[PDB]
Design a protein around this ligand. Structure first.
Ligand SMILES: [Ca+2]
Ligand SMILES: [Ca+2]
Ligand SMILES: [Ca+2]
Ligand SMILES: [Ca+2]
Ligand SMILES: [Ca+2]
Ligand SMILES: [Ca+2]
Ligand code: NA
Ligand code: NA
Ligand code: NA
Length: 207
């Protein structure tokens, strides 16, 4: 009698990690299968979802990505591949893990930002709290804040987003400030950053 072939890839037993920045059309893996008769094998993928995502080269088992992955929309799923000799087809399921890349700059909410303070606001007064969110995994999802460029009059707590006065103000010299708040993520190799305006109105006080 003929013996049906069997898949041998490790990832049928564990998972296949594919990073979300894998370009469309690129090869993500090659299905490996063995057969007692040493028969020539044809390879496939099966299932509606798995077929929109993956294509397999029949003769080689090379698996190519048919469309973009996005860890922030869908971080994992389960697909079925097929292997056949002449006489029958075997299926195997594979859990796909979509690997994170740092692909999102920080996002600010609740804009625009403005605050109004007296010119006699004491040095050290906290006047405003900014926040930017970032959906990436790890350090690429962690935000540090700073003015771009630095201000001689205001500072931001790089971790907490707290804006505070660091030098005496003067309505007579400057009645209004328009500052760039920089939110940068903490990705080691490609940090991404976003800017947002802070309007600081200075109110006159009699001296
Ligand atoms: Ca066989
Ligand atoms: Ca993404
Ligand atoms: Ca990401
Ligand atoms: Ca990010
Ligand atoms: Ca003054
Ligand atoms: Ca004054
Ligand atoms: Na925050
Ligand atoms: Na985050
Ligand atoms: Na950016």
């Amino acid at each position: 009698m003929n013996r049906l072939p069997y898949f041998i890839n490790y990832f049928f037993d564990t998972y296949l990690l594919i990073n979300e920045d894998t370009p469309v059309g690129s090869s993500v893996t090659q299905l490996l299968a063995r057969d007692l008769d040493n028969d020539p094998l044809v390879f496939g993928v099966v299932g509606e979802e798995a077929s929109r995502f993956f294509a397999v080269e029949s003769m080689t088992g090379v698996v190519w990505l048919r469309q973009p992955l996005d860890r922030e929309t869908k971080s994992e799923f389960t697909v079925e591949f097929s292997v056949s000799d002449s006489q029958g087809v075997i299926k195997g399921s594979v859990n796909i893990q979509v690997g994170d890349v740092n692909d999102n700059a920080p996002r600010f909410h609740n804009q625009p930002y403005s605050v109004r303070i007296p010119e006699n606001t004491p040095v050290g007064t906290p006047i405003f709290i900014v926040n930017a969110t970032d959906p990436d995994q790890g350090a690429g999802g962690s935000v540090l804040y700073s003015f771009q460029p630095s201000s001689n009059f205001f500072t931001i707590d790089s971790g907490r987003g707290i804006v505070s006065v660091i030098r005496a103000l003067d309505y007579e010299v400057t009645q209004a400030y328009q500052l760039q708040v920089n939110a940068t993520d903490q990705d080691k190799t490609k940090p991404l950053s976003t800017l947002a305006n802070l309007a600081i109105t200075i109110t006159d006080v009699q001296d």
